Structures are given as C-alpha cells and as structure tokens.
Amino acid sequence: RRYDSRTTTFSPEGRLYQVEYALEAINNASITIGLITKDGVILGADKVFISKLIDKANNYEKIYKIDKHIFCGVAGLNADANILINQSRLYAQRYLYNYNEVQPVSQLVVQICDIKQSYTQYGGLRPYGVSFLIGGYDTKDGYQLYHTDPSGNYSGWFATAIGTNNLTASSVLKQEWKNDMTLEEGLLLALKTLAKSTDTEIPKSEKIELAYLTNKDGEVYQKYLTEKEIEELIKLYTQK
Amino acid sequence: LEYINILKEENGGYNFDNLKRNEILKEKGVKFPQFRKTGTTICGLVCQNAVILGADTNCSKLHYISKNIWCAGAGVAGDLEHTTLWLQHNVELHRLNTNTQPRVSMCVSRLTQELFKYQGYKVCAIVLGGVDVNGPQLYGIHPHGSSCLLPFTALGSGSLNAMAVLEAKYRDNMTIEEGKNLVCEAICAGIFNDLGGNVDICVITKDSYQHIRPYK
Amino acid sequence: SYDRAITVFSPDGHLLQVEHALEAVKKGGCAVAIKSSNFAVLAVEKKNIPKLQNPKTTEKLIKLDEHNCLAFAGLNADARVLVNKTRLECQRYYLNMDEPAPVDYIAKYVAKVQQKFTHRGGVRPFGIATLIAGFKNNKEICIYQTEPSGIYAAWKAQAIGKNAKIVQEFLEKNYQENMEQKDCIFLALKAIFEVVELSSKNVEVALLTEKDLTFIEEQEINSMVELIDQERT
Amino acid sequence: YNGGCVLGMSGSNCVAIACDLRLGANTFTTVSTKFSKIFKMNNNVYVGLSGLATDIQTLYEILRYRVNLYEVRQDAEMDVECFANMLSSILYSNRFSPYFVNPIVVGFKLKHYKVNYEPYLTAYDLIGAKCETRDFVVNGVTSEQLFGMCESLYVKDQDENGLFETISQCLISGWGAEVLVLTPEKIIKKKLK
Amino acid sequence: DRGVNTFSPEGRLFQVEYALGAIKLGSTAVGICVNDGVILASERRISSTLIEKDSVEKLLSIDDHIGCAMSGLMADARTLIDYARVECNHYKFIYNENINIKSCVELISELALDFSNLIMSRPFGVALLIGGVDKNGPCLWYTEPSGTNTRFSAASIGSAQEGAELLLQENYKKDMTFEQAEILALTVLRQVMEDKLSTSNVEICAIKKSDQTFYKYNTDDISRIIDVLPS
Amino acid sequence: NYLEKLNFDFKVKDVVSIRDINLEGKEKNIETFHDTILLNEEKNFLKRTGLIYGSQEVYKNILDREIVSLSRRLPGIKSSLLSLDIVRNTIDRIDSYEYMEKIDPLEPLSEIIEKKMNI
Amino acid sequence: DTLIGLRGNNFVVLAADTYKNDDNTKFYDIHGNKCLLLGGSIGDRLQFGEFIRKNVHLYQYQNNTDMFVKSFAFFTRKNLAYYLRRNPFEVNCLIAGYDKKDGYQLYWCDYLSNMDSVNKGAHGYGAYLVSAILDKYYHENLTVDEALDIFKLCFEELKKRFLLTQINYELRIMYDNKVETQYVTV
Amino acid sequence: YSFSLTTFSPTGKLVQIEYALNRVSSSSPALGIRAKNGVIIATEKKSPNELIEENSIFKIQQISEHIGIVYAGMPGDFRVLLKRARKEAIRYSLQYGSEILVKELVKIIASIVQEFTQTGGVRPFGLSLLICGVDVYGYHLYQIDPSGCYFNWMATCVGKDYQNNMSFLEKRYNKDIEIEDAIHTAILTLKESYEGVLNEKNIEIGVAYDNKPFKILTQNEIKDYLI
Amino acid sequence: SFMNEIDNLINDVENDELEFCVAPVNVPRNFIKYAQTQNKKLFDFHKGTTTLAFKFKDGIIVAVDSRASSQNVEKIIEINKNILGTMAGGAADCLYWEKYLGKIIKIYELRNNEKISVRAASTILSNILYQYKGYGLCCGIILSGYDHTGFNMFYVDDSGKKVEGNLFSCGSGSTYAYSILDSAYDYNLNLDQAVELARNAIYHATFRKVRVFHIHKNGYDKI
Predict the structure, then answer these.
(1) Residue-wise over E45-62: b if at least 16 C-beta within 10 A, else e?
(2) Can you tell me which residues the record assigns to a coiled coil (chain A) (predicted)?
(3) How far apart (Å, rounded) are the C-alpha atoms in residues H97 and G31?
(4) Is CATH 3.40.50.620 the classification given to domain H5-227?
C-alpha cells in the first residue's frame, strides 16, 4: 500500500501526472516526419546513432508495416512500439478475417487509442510511452494520416512531426507545403525538414530512412527506401 | 481457482465451433468421406544391444523421436503424425533442458498418459522402442494406454502372420543381420499374405543410427 | 491499483478526485446547447492548426442513436470510451424495446456509469461532463447535463467548458421560449463566441431535428459571424 | 452437397492446378454455377479447398489471416512447408468435428543459392495426413475416377503447353472447370467448357 | 496515507466520520410521522431559472407505499433508491405482501455499510429519510452513513437542519392530524427557507393510511396548503 | 443452485452475443470434457500434494499461482505468464493448449475490462 | 415460407410469403440501402435478424459510415455460423443491397452458412418450383417491371401447384438509391 | 494491489530499468561477431573459488539446432529466459514444422521482457541477452536489453568496460572476415579487458557454422585457438 | 473460508430461491422428457383454459373459461394497470413469467418515469421465454392493453413468437373459437354484442363458468 505509485490519479489542478512524463519521453526521441501528397503518403524518420556497427541494411527500427495497406512510425520507446504494432496487426487481421475487407485506418487508430486509454484509466500499470503516425489509403476517404498519443487523443494531419525539435519541423512544414504536390516534391520536403530539424545542412544518408505508399494501378504498394535511393534523393536535393 | 481460468482464456487449445452443425448434418442422413486408415503391418524386436523396428509403406511409417528412439504407428494417420511430433519435440525440449540422453521409459510414460487421457477416441497404436542407459527396450502401446515391455511386438491389420513368424523364429543374442532377415520374414510375409508398398528397416543403436527406406 | 479506492472522502466531506475531474472538465473546450419547440441546436468550440491539421477528423457533434446526440468537454479519449459504451447501451435498449431510446434513459445511464467510476476500485472518474439532446418517448425535445460526480439535471439552455459561467449568465439573460431555427442558431453562435474569438473556423454548429442532425454549411456560418462582427461595433 | 474434384500436375519448373466449379445444397439441387475453390494464398502458394462451401470459405479466411500475420511479422517471403504444417495444425485443432474440405497444397520450393525453383505438392485427409508426393497428386470426393487418368497420362517433365493439355484432357460435381498453370515468371488462368 | 477501513484512536472509522461530514451539505428536507401518515417534504433548491424543474426532484418513490428524501451526494443517493426499489419489488415477487418499511431500511443500511470487506470501495455519503405505511401504521426512518438507523416521530435533514429539528422539537405534539402535520411541515420549511415559500419552490409526497399510495402533491394542492398557513 | 440467478436485470438480449442452447447446464459432450481438461489435472495434483505433504503446501501453491497470475497485462494484449509457467512447472512441457490457436469479436475493450474484473 | 430474390443490371427485388397474413417478422431494413430477409421459426427470425440489424447499427453509428454490402453479407454469414453453434435451428438468409464500389448485388445463404453470390436465389418449401422459372425466364439487361412479372408468374405457379389459396406476398425493391415496399396479392 | 513499480519518473527516462542497465554495466563481458561463414559468441566466465566444475557453469547455451545464446547479468534470469525461449522455439516447430527464425524469437523475447518491465508488482530483468543464429535468411546476431529494445548488431560487447571493448572490436573488424579471424578477434577482445592472465577454463566460445549445427567449442579447441 | 474449501477439495466431500436447479444427466434439456418416458403421474401439470381476446371500437374484450383437477382457477393476471395478461398451456410457467414480467415492468415504470408500451412488454416476455426454450417450457399468453401508440394485442409463446394483430385465441380447442370468430366478428361492434359474441364463442369452445373483462383506455372493468 505504502509502495503504490498511483498512476491513474489526477494532478492537483487538472492532469494525469504520468501521462505528462510519458509525453516528455515523446519529446526525448528521434524526430519522425509525416506528410500527405497527391500520389502517396510519405513518412520519414531520423535514425539515432547507437553505433557505427549497427546493421544499416534491413534494420528499419522507426517505420513498420501493420498491414498490406497500413504502416506507421514511432517516436518513443521501441519495446512498447513492437507490442503495440503487434496488437495493431492482430486487430487489422481480425477485422479482415471477420468482415472480409481491408481495415479503415480510423478504426485501427481508434482501437490502439483504446489500448492506450485502457492503460491510462484502468488498473494501476504505467501508461504506454510511445506516439504513432498511422497513415495509409482506403476507398472511404482516400489517403489519410493520424497522430495518436499516450493520452488516447488523436486527430488527422496533412503534415506533422513528433520527437525532438518538433516545433522546427512543424514550422518548416507550415511554409513549404502544397495540396497538389507530387511524390518527388514531398520526398524533397521530407529531406529539407529532416535536415532542418537535425541542424545539418547536408542530410547524412546513413542517418535517415524514408518510405511511402503508392496506389498505382488500383493496388496499394508500400516501398521502403534503401541507401542508394536515399543518396540519389539527397544528391538531387542538394542540386536544387 | 481463478488463475487457471486466466490461463485457459489467454492460451489456445481445441476449438469446438462446429459441433451442432455436424450433429444436424449427420442426423439428416448424408454419407461423408472416410478417414485415411494407414494401419498396415508393423513389428519390432529386441536384438543384441539394439532395437530393430519394422514397417511398410509411399507413407514412411518409421518416425523419429530421438537419435536412439524410433517408432512405427498403425491407425489414423493424423493422430499418429501429431502424437509422434509431440513426443519427439517433448523429448527434445527435455533433452535441451536437462542435458541427458533420452530414455525410452520417459517416452512410454508420456505416451501412456496422453493416450489414457483420451479413452479410445484416438486410434493410435505405436510400437516405440530404442536404446537407453538401461539397454534396449521395446514397448507395445495400445489405443487404451497400456504399455508392456515385450521381447518382440507385432501390430497392424496383418499382425497375426508377423507375430506367428516372430514367435516361430525368435532367439536371444541374435545377430543384427539375422534381425533384419527376421524383420523381413515378418513384414514381407505379412504384406504378401494380408491384403503393401516397400518394407522399412532401421536399427536403433545407442549412437550413429541408420535408416533404410528402400529396404525391399 | 486493482481493488483499491482511488477516490475517497476527504476530511471536509469532499471527494478530491471528483473535484480534480471538475477542474479538468473546466479546462476543456466550450460547448453550447439550446432547445425550443421540437429541435435543439448544438455547438462546440473547434481548435485546429491551420495548414497542417485536418478539420474532418476532429468531430465533436457525434450522434449516439437515431435521435439522441451527445456533446462533451474535457478528455477526448474518455469521451470516446463512454460514447462507445452509450452507443452499445442504446442498441441494447432498442433491441429490448424495438423503439428508439429516449433522452432521459440514456442520460440516467450516463449518470449511473459516471457515478460507478467514482465508487469502484481501480477506476478513476471520467474527466468529462457530457450533455445529451434528443426526444423522449413522448416526442418532446429535452436536454440533460451530466458531470463527473454523476449528478444530472434537465436544462433548457446550458453550456460547459472553459468560461462556462459567463455563457450560462448570458443565456439566462437572453434566452427566449419557442424560438425559430435561425434565432436558435444565432443565439448559440453568440453564446459560444462570448468566450471564444470571433472566427468561422472555431465553431461546428449543427441543428438536431427529428429527421437527423443536420450540420450547418460553412457559408451560413460565415454570414452569421460577419453579421455578429457588424453588430458588435 | 457442394462437392467437387481438384487436380494437380508437376513438371519441369512448372506446376498446374485445376478444379471444377459446382455449389449446391439438398444433395442434388444446384444453386450456383460458379464458386471459388482455388485460392491464391501467395505468389508461390495456391490452395485447392474442395468440399462444403462454408468450410471452404472459413478455412480460406483462417489461412489468409494466419499467413498474413506471419508475412507481416516476418517481413519476408514464406516457405511452402510452413503453410503446409499450418494447415495440418489447423485441421487437427478440430480433431473432433473437422473442417469438411479435402485440401490440396501446391507451391514452389525456393532454394536460395540466386534462387532455384522446384515443385512442391501434397495431399491431405479430413484430419491432416501430409504425404510428400512430388509427382501427380489427386484429391476430391470423386477422386476415384481421377486416379485412373492421373496414373495413365503422367509423362514426368513436360512443356507448359503440354502440361496444360494433359491436365485439361485428364480433367454432386461438374458445371464447368478452371485451370491455373503456375510458372516461376508467370501464371495463366483459363476456363474449360 | 490510510486505507478505506482504519479505526481512529477513539474507535471511530475515519471514512464513516468523513461521510457524516458530507451529509450536512445538501438541501433541506422535513418529515412528520403522524398517525395518519408521513408528510416527507423537500426544498427544490433551484440552481438557476433555466432549470427545467422536472428531472431535478428530491422526493423519489422506493415503492407505491414508500417515500423518501435524499441529501448529500446525489448520484450515490439515486443508487441507494434504485437498489432499495429493486429489492422491494424482489420481496414483492417472493412474498405476496408489500415490503415493510423496517426491512427496506435494513436493505438500505446493509447497502450503505458494504464498503468494508465484511464490489463497493468507499462508504455511501448519503443521509436518507425513508417513510411509509405498513400493516402496523405509519413508520418514519433514517439512515446516516454510519449505519445506526433509527426511527423518528419527526425529522429533518440537509444543511441548516439544526433550526428545523429544534423547531420540530418545539412544535410537535402527539395525536396530530394530517392537516396539522401539513401546516407544521410548511411552517418549519418557511422558517428554514432562505427565500420565500412560493408554490413551485417545494415538493411534498404523502402516503396516507387509508390509501397507502405515493401521491406527490400537485401545484394546486401545494398552493392550498401554503394559503392555509397562519401569519 | 444452477443457471445463474434471476435478479430483474432486464438486459437479457444483448447486441454482442446470443444465449447457448444449454444456457449453463453444460451437457457432457467432448467440448465439455475438454473444457475441464486442465482444472481436473491440477485438482488431482493439489490432491496429491496436500494429501501426502499437508494442506499448507496446497495453500502456498494456490497463493503463489494467484500472485504470479495476478502479475499480468490488462485484458486485451495477451500476457506471457512466464512466472505462472515456472510455478506450475509447465515450462518444460509443450501441450495442446500452448500450440494451436483460437481467433477471437463484437465486445469493445471497455466491456471486456468490465466483464473480466467486475467494474 | 418461401423466399425469392433477384438481381441484375440496376435492380434488386426480394419477395416472401407473409403468413395472420401480414407477417412483418421477415424483412428487416438496415440503415442505408440494405435489407435482410430471413426464413424459419418466428422466434429464431426475430432473434437473429434483430441481432444482425442492431450490430450493423452499432458498427455504422460508432464509425459514422455505411457498411459495405459484401462486408454485411460475410458478417451475417459469420454470425449465422456462430448462432447455429449456440442454437441448433435452421435459418435461411438472403442478403442483398447496394454499394458504391460494385453497384447492386444479391447473396444466397443457407442454414449451413454456405453463402455465395447469385443473380437468382430461392429458399423454403417452394424453392424447387420457383428456381426452374427463374432459370428459364431470367435474362441480362432486365428491367424491374418484368422482374416483378416473373415473380407474379412464380406466385401463380405456386398457387396452381399446391392447394394454397388467397396467398399473399410482400415485395421489397431497391433501385436508383431508393427503397420501396409493396403488397401484391394473387 | 497490482501497481507498476517501474514508473515514469520526472523528466521521463524510465528510471527503474536504468538501474538494471547498471547491473549490465557491472557484469562480465560477453561479446559476439557475425562472420561471413558463421556467427561467433564469446564470454568471460570467472573462477571465483577454483573448486567449481567448469562444465557445470554454462553461459553459452543452445536453444535450437542453429541458435545459440549468451548473456551478461545474473544467472537465474538467463535460465528462465532460456527455458521460455526454448519453449517458444518448439512452439514454432509444432506450429510450422521448421526451425524458428532468429527475428521471431528475438521479437517474442523482447515482448516478454517488456511485459515484465510493464507488469504490475514485478521488477525488470537484470541481463542483456545476445541472440545469435543461422537460417535461410543468412546469419543473425541480436541483443535484447532489459528495456526490451532489440538491435540487429554485427559485432557487439556487453558487460564491464563495454565501451572500450566495442571500440577495440570496431578498430579491427571488417564485413568480410573468416570464421578463424573472427574467433581470433573475439579472443583478443576478451583478453584486452580481463585484468589478469587469460588461459584455459577462463573463457567459453560458441560458434554456429554456415551449415553445421551450433557447437560449443571444447576446452582443447579453445586452447588451440589461444595459441 | 478458503481453509474449508481446500479441505473439502482434498477430502472429496463437497441455494437462493430464484436460482434454477438442473439435472446432472448427460443432456439436462431433455431430462424431463426422459422422465416422461418413465411415468406421467408427476408430469400432469394443471393446464390452462382456452382464452379469447379481441379488439373492438371502444376497447378490448378478453374472455376465458374456468377448467384446469380444478374448475375455479383464475386465468388472467394483472401485468400492469393497463396491460392484462392471459394464461394458456402450462399454468405454472405462464403464471410465473407473467408475474416476473410484471415485476420488470414495475421496476421500469419506477426508475424510468413513463408508462411502458405493450410492444415492449411482449418483447421482454418473448425474450425471457426464448431464453429457456429447449429446456422444455409450455406457455401461451396473449398480451392485450392500451399504450401511447393506441391499443395492442401482442401474442407471445414459449418459442419466442411475437405476432401483432387484432384477433387471437390460444389453448385447447382454439380452432373452434377461431372458426366461430371468423364466422361472426366486426370491429365496429357494441360492447353488449361484443361480450355476447365472446360468451358464445367460449361456450362453443368448451362444448365440442366463463369470466370476461373489458379493457378500456383508463384501465379495465370486471363484469
């Protein structure tokens, strides 16, 4: 009794204490960018330099695939992200198993928010310290992107950022962004805002990773960028 | 006991969704396709410091439990296959955890409990035997779960001829080649007498076994 | 914790946890509701970042069932969870009756649930004060207003959220009986803008009629906010 | 009761599958002349669920769920034997009251050297009785007739056109049929009168 | 700091005393248990003019032959009345005769005191005043959160109940008829109302001996009994 | 006695599930025998232990098993329950309830928390 | 109780024997352009159809969208299978509707939940007789009025073959994003 | 009474697990190199009493036919994690009839470790597992921390003086290296930070070859590679 | 206590009124049926008398004869002040569920301050009757009364039936009553002609002491 942490408890004025500290963890992670384009949905990320001996090939620890038409990216603790992405995969596949259709992204973010709200409200266990950037395509409303948080709130975003230096990324996205933007322009904007947030002029190819979801020929197709195309994109960015 | 309810809820098991639909279908009077009854002649014998099992197929009846434990099944193919996989992997997990040579008695006890838990529903006859620290041991598991350490065993549809030949021409301290000859004298004779395929021979030595699927 | 009284009585006969839920509600966004004749206009304060945020996803004037509708202020995730509970409960009630759910029953159920979270172990209070609007079995428009404490009371024109008292005083001074649709929408817009900056993007007013919840178009909102700006000077 | 008859043929770096199309209830009363029995689980996995239509649909969607979960978790290509033992385990999970289809698994072994393509075929019983044939294999309620032509018309390695001709000529059940010829670099679906 | 069940140095439960501290905050209600019946009244504390004054009622019917008045925390009190009427109609189901008032207040008390493990977590901070008629005449009851239920000739609950109980002690007399009980209750109310005693600012429910029905008085009856008061 | 207890709940028809044909009589068929497949075995084990060794052993075993089982995630995401496997000594064994799987549909997560631990 | 259903280019029509001869326990109008027609016992119909309709209402209201017809058909198939698991009684299912993705469509499902998409579906005691007429006279590019004429001829055939008299039917019609109900007596 | 003892502190950082990392900083070194023809894992096992049976105190254990495991922490958590990892491996084997891929087992163990960090009334684990293996997708070498995060490492060191050991390994590591050169680099890195004289019975070396099963090298083989 | 529970567990030595006991037989749902093979003296329950209920211009007529073992058993229960329930088939089952439905209706009227609809009461009764279908349950009830949506004559049975109409009659010989009623019936009938028709039809039913009640918009009379 005397050792109780008292997680699910309001503050003196209006707030859940642990939920704030969880948000501070979201403010102490690698920056993740999210965009909406006229021919896809771009979601880059910044790789924290753990060491030079990390296997750069096929170790995309920021962006993950939840379903054949849904992906996401994290800006918090990766261990929580693995379990939460696993549960998102389970809900999406169970929806496809029961209803025989591809999961709308709104329902999936509602369900993962229900997970995070259940840990926020029910029981005494600590909340989930990670914020997602779920985005994808569906026939209901075309391309969509969302922003969940440990408090359970969520909302749509044409362009957004989370993590360290999120204010600078949001300021960069506010100025240079257009509705009728091609995929290449969105990728160059992703490079520009990632470089601005990282404070470096030339983005480092090894220190970033990118992905997108094209809907060509009436079929969803996710492509995750590797080192060669990242270098080509950076070279075209510096030359323009 | 609430924790066992939690364990049941979290973990899976045998789902039972379509009992009522099958009850309606069988009561309505339609014939449904039959099971694959892979019950053929199988036998084994305790030779000089090595068990020598026997069976017949292109379904290879000789299944692997451990490097010194093989077995032969007779009954429903799915029950035999899954039970054999379960026993092999249980013994492998025990060997990894305990770090000791596998023992035939542990296999016999596990098979006996598993088959006794299901009284007659699992058509599953196994003639499991092998070499352990206590020498060679051959057993005669039945679908009711009654093991018995016999010097030689013969189960299957054509088990009578094989058992008669083994009872006629069994001797102690037998040579391995003579064991193989007696194994064919049981299995080949039972194939040609009883209402097939190729015979199967595998000597179960304490180490460095060998499998002969094209035996004859 | 599991089986632990999170909320307990204080030395001065007060539930401090329920009190914290009350100022949590007060720190939330505003929302106004008016009733007259056979309809009830409903308005909520909208807060979105221009050029980045999607206004479509941010929805506040949900519909619970065929007739009843619910607005809220405070925690959005708590509101979504209680909305799922209330919608499931409305379908349960409509299964047993084969008749639409009246506003009084679902208001009492919301009050019961919000009381339950203030009286059970391992559950904190719901940090919202929802107000339901809809037609009873008699088919007369009425509005109720719950709180985290579970107290409910029928209202004719009520508001919640930040600076709620100013809007309540304004509505008490200015509200009339048996008003028109345009008059009701104008009063709701003026009431919410008494404590909200005068702009079209910060309101998503909709009118509830027996057919449905009809969301007011952007052009009408633009004309009314320009008219209010002209009338202010 | 919605019965059918599926067929599979191997050859030099190409494998073909075929199935009739007949759904009907009340023993002999047709209600639909076009029902899916061949399902493309993956680029290199095709399942030939034949039997009661409800069990075909249920086992197909269960297998789709599990295979999609494995693919998303693994984030890589899936082996055919993994699907085969998955289907065997799912069939044995209803040891009592099984699923009442007679499945047939057709796939390609990918030996990562770059990659070598090999056939892979196997039959199944009502419980799950995996046998690694690697030649022709036949399954269905009316498989007793089909075993004759399956044994008679076998050639070993064949040209893709020759394999299609052989399986087409060899091929409660009826109402048209379809043939899917699988190759490492193409797939051809065509219906027979 | 401490659990929900921990005795004080004086052998008094802390949570029970805090619950008894909360019942004082509430709306005034008064009842007279005269021989003819019970005249359980209330205040109708109007928060504002915009209150509809139809869904906010303090006097609820536990059963047709039972009346009550709520005080303190209101949602909790509604839960008490709901459980009380549920078990009352359960008693009607098992047993043909209507439930006595005494047994009903025992069900209410064992609802109130179940918060200790002896599910509910904290005590019910409510002070109800149950009253109704049964085969042995009228009966008026009371249940503080501590569970020491006790019957009353006449009682008052809510904020500023000291003046109400003092005046009831100074005016109540035996063999008082039903109209005398009505005017006594209205006089006590008006002498503890902060505002004027208007027709719509009071709620009264009566369970008469002959009728044995929960008749909540309408506007005309309230107006008549207000008019017949003395100077 | 059986068949739950009527309490004038008034919510008999739900929008998540339908009543079974047997309600709660639980007629003895293969699914009923497989339901009580693990409870009976542990009943036999507790019988053996608390008989030969003393009922305090069964008491310690039940409290340890409840304590480790009480340490688990909320309903929703599946819990590993490793400590329960160590205490019950089933980590060495692989059994039918470990492998296989049940896919499971209409209940919101909050209703599951209410049903699991009575809120 | 015979149930009949037809679909083609821009029409869906469903019919059933209302039999009291005003049986409202068969048809259930889902919100949006969707209907569920069921056959069997009255209590089984009133349980299963209500369960499906209230579940679909919960789904559509909790998400602020319209269930697609294919999802509704497969969901009703799954819930029919689960219901037969929990209640061993026969229930026939005739899901039909309209969706923006693939226009109009009809589905045919039995008590075994052997659901499949068809252009002509029949259930009940009179399923054999009506199915022959639907096979004979149905053709592509059919306009709805002649489809109702086929249904009238099927009603006449069922009147002639069996000893029933004064038989009644209720027709539910879907076209042009509109739902219509009629009561034909022959 | 179920509450989480691992609670988010002010300024985040999830402080309780960080204390477990201090135990990982206070443990003996346990490294491993992913070679072009195999994968190697090595460790420094102490001689605290000089009466210990060297065979009995295993640290480099085997889960599957081509999956090894080594750790740096307290031994009981290693034992229970090894037992559950083996149970999950056989669970995959019955589910799918094949050897468990390294990524799936690493994800499962990460989920279990994160579960225990998050679960009410139980402390986190006190070790940093170091998975290695071979499969159809090539060689693999992962590292599950007490926090549960898994990293696809190529050459890593965990224990006392892990920074200097990793720097020394990075100074003399290349992508294209033979199994013998990898073993020699492992021995040199272990001998770099020992604080004494390294000899027989003080280290244990496990290797999984390109096609052979994962074998733990005997004492004679380790002595031969020492020279 | 937990001590006694574990003691009873090891020793192998192991009841509210509203809880329903069931047999430990293999299939309890058919248990009574199996017992009906053994004997029939026990399973000779008091069966209800045929009931005849119908609407007309002013209100509703509900007539029923008295014939069970007994011949003075009341066959109509007061579900509500405006709803009157009938009894047909097994007397115990319909009587008990009518009382329990009345208690549910009383709870609903108390907490939700509004008069319940006849459709709602019929739906509730049909749902609880279907809840115990298959266990063996005989009950024929004709709900009849006023509600804010006019008059209503909902008919419910053990099998979850729920049929709205204007003419209904259930029990033994109900087909004769239906024949006479179809021979003579009109909505715009006088009260005297209506009760005479009801008496004649009931007398026809129990030939091959009648009690009749008139339900009106402000309750029901006893004539």
Answers:
(1) beeeebbebebbebbbbb
(2) none
(3) 48
(4) no
**Cβ contact G115–D32 (<8 Å):** no
Q: How far apart are CA H109 and CA E225, in angstroms?
A: 78
The Cα C145–Cα C131 span in angstroms is: 4
Paired with E13 in beta bridges are E7
B20–chain G Cβ distance below 8 A for any pair: yes
Q: Residue E104 and residue E89: Cα distance in Å, rounded? A: 11
| Distance, CA of E76 to CA of E114 (rounded, Å) | 14
> Which residue carries 């099927």 as its tokens?
G154
Mark yes or no for CB contact C80/A152 under 8 Å.
yes
- Both tokens of A11, joined, read 């503050």
Task: Assess contact for G92 and G77: CB atoms under 8 A.
Answer: no
Instruction: Flag if C95 and G58 touch (Cβ within 8 Å).
Output: no
Give the list of residues 6+ apart from residue H49 with CB closer than 8 angstroms, or none.
none
B1-27: b or e for each residue (b if 16 or more CB lie within 10 Å)? bebbebbbebbbbbbbbbbbbeeebee
User: Is the domain defined by C16-232 classed in CATH 3.60.20.10?
Assistant: yes
Residue of chain C nearest G60, judged by CA positions: C65
Sign of the C-alpha dihedral computed for residues C68, C71, C75 and C80 taken in this order: positive
**Which of F19, F23, F106, F111 should one mutate to test binding to chain G, selecting the residue with the greatest count of G CBs within 10 A?**
F106
Q: Quick one: DSSP state of residue H177? A: -
Place of tokens 């809820």: B9
Question: Residue H42 and residue H187: Cα distance in Å, rounded?
Answer: 8
Q: Which superfamily does G1-186 belong to? A: Aminohydrolase, N-terminal nucleophile (Ntn) domain (3.60.20.10)
E133 domain-assigned = yes
b/e map A95-116, b = 16+ CB within 10 Å: bbbbbbbbbbbbbbbbbbbbbb
Q: Which chains have 3+ CB pairs within 8 A of D?
A: A, B, F, G, H
- For residue G57, what are its two tokens? 């209402």
Residues 6+ apart with CB under 8 A from C144: C103, C104, C107, C131, C132, C152, C153, C154, C155, E55
Query: DSSP label at B28?
Result: T
Contact H23, H74 (CB under 8 A): yes
Q: Take residue C138 and report the two structure tokens written for it.
A: 């008699």
For tokens 């006969």, name the residue: C13
Task: Name every residue whose Cβ is closer than 8 Å to that of residue G135 and which is 6 or more positions away in sequence.
Answer: G120
| G111 within 8 A of G127, measured Cβ to Cβ | no
Comparing CA positions, the residue from C114, C110, C117 lying closest to residue C131 is C110
Strand order in the sheet with I76-78: I76-78, I83-86, I144-147, I150-152
The domain made up of D4-193 is a member of CATH 3.20.20.80:
no
The CATH code of the domain that includes E186 is 3.60.20.10
Write down the experimental method used for this entry: cryo-EM
Enumerate residues 6+ apart whose C-beta is below 8 A from B214. Answer: B198
Give residue for tokens 């709520």.
E70
Chains I and H share 3 or more Cβ pairs within 8 Å: no
Kindly state whether I199 is in contact with chain G, defined as any CB-CB distance less than 8 angstroms: no
Contacts of B82-87 with C-beta under 8 Å, sequence gap 24+, read: B82/D88, B82/D92, B82/D128, B83/B111, B83/B114, B83/B115, B83/B122, B83/B124, B83/B126, B84/B126, B85/H94, B85/H97, B86/B114, B86/F94, B86/H94, B87/B111, B87/B114, B87/B128
In a domain, E66, yes or no: yes
- Interatomic CA distance for residues H75 and H57, integer angstroms: 10
Which chain H residues are Cβ-neighbours of F73 within 8 angstroms?
A: 115, 118-119
Q: Between β-strands G96-99 and G103-108, what pairing exists: parallel, antiparallel or unpaired?
A: antiparallel
